[PDB]
Design a binder for this molecule. Sequence first.
Ligand SMILES: Cc1noc(C)c1-c1cc(C(N)=O)c2c(c1)c1ccc(C(=O)N3C[C@@H](C)O[C@@H](C)C3)cc1n2CC1CC1
Length: 121
Amino acid sequence: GHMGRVTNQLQYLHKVVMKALWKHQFAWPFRQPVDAVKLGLPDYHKIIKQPMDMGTIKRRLENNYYWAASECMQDFNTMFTNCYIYNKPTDDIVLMAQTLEKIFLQKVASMPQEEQELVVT
Ligand SMILES: Cc1noc(C)c1-c1cc(C(N)=O)c2c(c1)c1ccc(C(=O)N3C[C@@H](C)O[C@@H](C)C3)cc1n2CC1CC1
């Protein structure tokens, strides 16, 4: 019971935002879902109810899964927040998320302000 589309903001999130974040030095733990068995975190899925990662976001952008840019921005917010709330403040993963979230926020500030659907053939 869901469908997506191509908007100017969603295209910006794919072509500008995801391009800057995907290739970053600190992106590698965020490129695929948190593997709690590999990491030895048996409480992860008890605490985190909505896991999210950049690989899922990228795939969703490529397959036009989102109806609006706000849904994609929520996925980014969830991914960063999951990381901060679950982990210890002294874990380096926290600083890696902080570095990427700062880039994310700056790019969102430069996004075209009004959401419009595009005709993409
Ligand atoms: C994100 C995130 N939020 O909370 C946590 C915890 C995470 C989060 C998520 C993942 C994941 N996606 O499963 C994850 C890590 C942290 C993580 C930390 C360290 C190492 C590690 O020790 N390495 C790998 C490095 C390439 O080389 C070293 C030599 C050894 C692997 C890790 N992975 C595995 C991923 C590479 C596939």
